[PDB]
Amino acid sequence: MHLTPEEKSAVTALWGKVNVDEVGGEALGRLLVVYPATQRFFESFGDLSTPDAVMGNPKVKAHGKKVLGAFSDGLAHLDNLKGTFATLSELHCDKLHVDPENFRLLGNVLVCVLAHHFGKEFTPPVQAAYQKVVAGVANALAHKYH
Amino acid sequence: MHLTPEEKSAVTALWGKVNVDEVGGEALGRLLVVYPATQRFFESFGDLSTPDAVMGNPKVKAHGKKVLGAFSDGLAHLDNLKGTFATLSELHCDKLHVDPENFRLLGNVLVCVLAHHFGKEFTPPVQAAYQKVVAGVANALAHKYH
Amino acid sequence: VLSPADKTNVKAAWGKVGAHAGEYGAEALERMFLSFPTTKTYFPHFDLSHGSAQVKGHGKKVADALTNAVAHVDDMPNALSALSDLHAHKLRVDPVNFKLLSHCLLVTLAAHLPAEFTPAVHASLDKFLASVSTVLTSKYR
Amino acid sequence: VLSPADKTNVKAAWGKVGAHAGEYGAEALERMFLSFPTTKTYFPHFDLSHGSAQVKGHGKKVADALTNAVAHVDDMPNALSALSDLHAHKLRVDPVNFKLLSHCLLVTLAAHLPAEFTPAVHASLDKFLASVSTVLTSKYR
Ligand code: HEM
Ligand code: HEM
Ligand code: HEM
Numbered sequence A, B: 001m002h003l004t005p006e007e008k009s010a011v012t013a014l015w016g017k018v019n020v021d022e023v024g025g026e027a028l029g030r031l032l033v034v035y036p037a038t039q040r041f042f043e044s045f046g047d048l049s050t051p052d053a054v055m056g057n058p059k060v061k062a063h064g065k066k067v068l069g070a071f072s073d074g075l076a077h078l079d080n081l082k083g084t085f086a087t088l089s090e091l092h093c094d095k096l097h098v099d100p101e102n103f104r105l106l107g108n109v110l111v112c113v114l115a116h117h118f119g120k121e122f123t124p125p126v127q128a129a130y131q132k133v134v135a136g137v138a139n140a141l142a143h144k145y146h
Numbered sequence C, D: 001v002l003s004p005a006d007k008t009n010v011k012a013a014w015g016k017v018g019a020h021a022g023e024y025g026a027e028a029l030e031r032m033f034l035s036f037p038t039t040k041t042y043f044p045h046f047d048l049s050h051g052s053a054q055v056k057g058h059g060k061k062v063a064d065a066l067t068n069a070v071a072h073v074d075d076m077p078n079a080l081s082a083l084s085d086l087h088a089h090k091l092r093v094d095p096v097n098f099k100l101l102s103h104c105l106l107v108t109l110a111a112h113l114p115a116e117f118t119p120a121v122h123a124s125l126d127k128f129l130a131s132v133s134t135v136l137t138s139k140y141r
């Protein structure tokens, strides 16, 4: 993951301050609201008819947390995202049928959430470093599609 | 570049039948005709106003041969595409300022041309192997952009 | 935008496709499934093996839709209206995939129509498939 | 396609941007250049060092074109017609790059307008920048 030492360190230091319950729910929720197409994969989550309904859904929130949970793992294994995400990849492909193009949408929403929460501290250099991470995760999640 | 033994054989098998001088011309020319925006990089080639003007331009034909030849080296080193294309990558970036998105366009036009030349022979499985290769070559050409 | 020359090019080439259309749409789909595996995610309910009757059956449906677009080349947005609702609002197919199917169609036509697939006709067909993709995709989000 | 509720969210969000628009436009370009280096291929004649004058100056340019688009949200094609010809016919910017600038602008707005960047407004700004991008690349080829 072509991450400079000062990049790895930039990513790590900020991640240490993330409230995973808030960010996880906000990112998953913003995906379904900003890109409603993605709602077809979570029909079993309940009512997602309106933004408020979406941000308040406890299934959206819990799932959001699990998602950020997996993203944390990748950060601890930046040198082997592929191996770290192989099972999840197989799952999103063979069992869930998710077009990997959606992985990028979640990555970018995720980046918009980090900026919303950290403001001035989410400087351009820090952003660039997160863009690389989010791309690497997307790519890793797509590796086993067949 | 996940190329199985059979994909590699298929690829190589087919390439040994390709007249490079000619296919190079066709591919670069079809590129300038189907995707006219890619003419912004070759104003020095003279007249590109119509299809005959492009396809028959001796400068287009000469350059196409050049491109196809580098494509060839690539095929002789499928397992080190990044190294092979490193100097061409820097050149296209630092001196020519070519947006890498154009590498995918050329790659696909080349697949169409192979399909045109070989009709039959260009089976789906063989197309698939070539799509991995053109993607691999475009990503390698993209690698040194900074 | 499809200019007059483009429309002529598209009518003449789809014309020479004739009764093979169904077979070409089917080959185009097989080419797409093999070259770009992510596209299969939209067809988990299909039998995706070589010769699959579902794939031939569907290839035929894809080709008939294109024939109807060619027949209504001056009113595609309305002629393909139902198919737009289907793709964008029901199936929710991400737009990149349209580029992949289109590329695969061009590959199929090239492999079967050596004499008609000249530079100019290739550019016109590419433009036409872009127009169709844009219509099928315009309400997507 | 913009809904009236979208039009309203965009006007209110942008109205808060107010006098900062220029600084925001410049921050968004700086973000784009560092995050997505291939976009620098369209600006070879620019000083792209941090805090450079061209970037800053160019940022005001972009931010004003967006201000004018918001004001003419109902008639974008007409209002943005000159920029569409510049981007699509003179500069020939590949459409992919528009999504990259749109995302960076979103990030910028997210980082400076905490209170206003709600999920609904986020969705409206995104559909808004996508419409602008569509008009600015409609003729690209
Ligand atoms: C950002 C990259 C993503 C990561 C790291 C990720 C990770 C995960 C994880 C950890 C699970 C839990 C699986 C389990 O424990 O059984 C999961 C399930 C799931 N994922 Fe993803 N995901 C990502 C993106 C997406 C996207 C973009 C979609 C669709 C838009 C999606 C759709 C699903 C669905 C529908 C489930 C099953 C939820 C359930 O059990 O009801 N994922 N994902
Ligand atoms: C298959 C991918 C490509 C390969 C292997 C390739 C290879 C080459 C080579 C060998 C040269 C000559 C280098 C030199 O002059 O020292 C060249 C030059 C050039 N390339 Fe590429 N190229 C590729 C794609 C592209 C495309 C897509 C564009 C832009 C649309 C492009 C734009 C140029 C330009 C403008 C030149 C200089 C032409 C001149 O002499 O004036 N290349 N490329
Ligand atoms: C040239 C562009 C395309 C055209 C003209 C087209 C045309 C059609 C037609 C005629 C149908 C059948 C509608 C009916 O039930 O009468 C259909 C359905 C469908 N299309 Fe497309 N299609 C296009 C592109 C795509 C792409 C890019 C995808 C996704 C990769 C896709 C996925 C589907 C799926 C999943 C169905 C439903 C199949 C089923 O479950 O029976 N199509 N399309």
Ligand code: HEM
Binding pocket: D039, D042, D043, D061, D062, D065, D066, D083, D086, D087, D091, D093, D097, D098, D101, D132, D133, D136
């Ligand atoms: C929100 C979308 C965009 C808007 C609203 C916008 C607006 C503008 C404006 C107002 C100008 C100045 C025109 C003049 O001086 O009269 C301009 C020029 C330019 N734009 Fe964009 N632009 C957008 C996206 C892009 C992107 C994606 C690219 C490519 C990355 C790009 C590349 C350029 C370039 C190279 C110039 C010429 C700069 C110079 O030489 O001074 N623009 N744009």
